[PDB]
Amino acid sequence: KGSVVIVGRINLSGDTAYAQQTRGEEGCQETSQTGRDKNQVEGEVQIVSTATQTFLATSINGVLWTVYHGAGTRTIASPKGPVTQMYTNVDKDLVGWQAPQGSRSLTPCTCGSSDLYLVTRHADVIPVRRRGDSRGSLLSPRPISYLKGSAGGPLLCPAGHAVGIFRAAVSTRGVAKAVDFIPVESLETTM
Ligand SMILES: C=C[C@@H]1C[C@]1(NC(=O)[C@@H]1C[C@@H]2CN1C(=O)[C@H](C(C)(C)C)NC(=O)O[C@@H]1C[C@H]1CCCCCc1nc3ccc(OC)cc3nc1O2)C(=O)NS(=O)(=O)C1CC1
Ligand SMILES: [Zn+2]
């Protein structure tokens, strides 16, 4: 099993929400084996890939977070070498590494706003309302297809702070009504 390789970012740089591929299939395959990745990394939200899976990962106060169901127990490739997991919790579906060289980090939310925004692998910013600790209702029903591959991605409050990490979609008859996420509180207890 190779290392997770950062293959793009979801950009909230300026006044538009958009994804950028920064590596291709073959070169990803090459980098996973060794774990040595020179590539220019930027930003808070990374697109990350394994041999079979592509998903998201979000840096929040110096730690890159994602889902175990995506990342398994794998290292993540870095300029120096494979980077071992800092945090690992299979029940929470959570893994964390040190935040990558080049990254920015989001700040945990302190607002307690319930208006939230899920950022997807397609670079859509989808509005969500807080349902409670770890659930949030989409204002606009989507098929599961649409959200698939956006695990590891942030739910942001209106200040652009992180509320949590997208974990799963609450679906009936193929339609996501709500989403499940790992709250920052739970990260900050995991830390
Ligand atoms: C729509 C996008 C959605 C974010 C995505 N997540 C999933 O697909 C998860 C993974 C798996 C099933 N998922 C679901 O979302 C299901 C599904 C019907 C399939 C939508 N929904 C669901 O259970 O609803 C129940 C209320 C919630 C209860 C919570 C479920 C538990 C979460 C979960 N935890 C663990 C911990 C450890 C494991 O060890 C290997 C494995 C796990 N697997 C898990 O669920 C995603 O995009 N992934 S991804 O990016 O495509 C892939 C590359 C990584
Ligand atoms: Zn906030």
Author numbering: 989 to 1179
Task: Provide the authors' own sentences about this structure as they appear in the paper.
The HCV NS3/4A protease – a chymotrypsin-like serine protease – is a prime therapeutic target that cleaves four known sites along the virally encoded polyprotein. The NS3/4A protease also hydrolyzes two human proteins, TRIF and MAVS, which are part of the innate immune system, thereby confounding the innate immune response to viral infection. In this study, we report that four chemically representative protease inhibitors – telaprevir, danoprevir, vaniprevir and MK-5172 – exhibit distinct susceptibilities to the protease variants R155K, A156T and D168A. To elucidate the underlying mechanism by which chemically diverse inhibitors bind to the wild-type protease and drug-resistant variants, crystal structures were determined for 16 inhibitor-protease complexes. These complexes include wild-type protease and resistant variants R155K, D168A and A156T each bound to telaprevir, danoprevir, vaniprevir and MK-5172, with resolutions ranging from 1.10–2.50 Å; S139A protease variants were used except for telaprevir, which requires covalent bond formation with the serine 139 for efficient binding.
The most potent of the NS3/4A protease inhibitors is MK-5172. Against wild-type protease, macrocyclic inhibitors danoprevir, vaniprevir and MK-5172 exhibited antiviral potencies in the sub nM range (IC50 = 0.24, 0.34 and 0.11 nM, respectively), while telaprevir potency was significantly lower (IC50 = 1030 nM), consistent with previous reports. The acylsulfonamide groups of danoprevir, vaniprevir and MK-5172 were also positioned in the oxyanion hole, hydrogen bonding with the same set of backbone amide nitrogens, as observed previously for the TMC435 and danoprevir structures. Meanwhile the Nε nitrogen of H57 interacted with the sulfonamide nitrogen in these complexes, suggesting that the Nε atoms were deprotonated. In contrast, MK5172 adopted a novel conformation with the ether-linked P2 quinoxaline moiety not interacting extensively with R155 and D168, but stacking instead against H57 and D81 of the catalytic triad. Notably MK-5172, with an ether-linked P2 quinoxaline moiety, while protruding from the substrate envelope, stacked against the catalytic triad, avoiding direct van der Waals contact with R155 and D168. Unlike in the danoprevir and vaniprevir complexes with wild type, in the MK-5172-wild-type complex the P2 quinoxaline moiety did not stack on R155 and interacted less with D168 and the electrostatic network involving these residues. We report here, for the first time, a novel binding conformation for MK-5172 in which the P2 quinoxaline moiety binds far from the S2 subsite and instead stacks against the catalytic residues H57 and D81. MK-5172 has a unique barrier to resistance, as neither catalytic residue (H57 or D81) can tolerate mutation. The high potency of MK-5172, for example, derives from interactions with the essential catalytic triad residues, which cannot mutate without severely disrupting viral fitness.
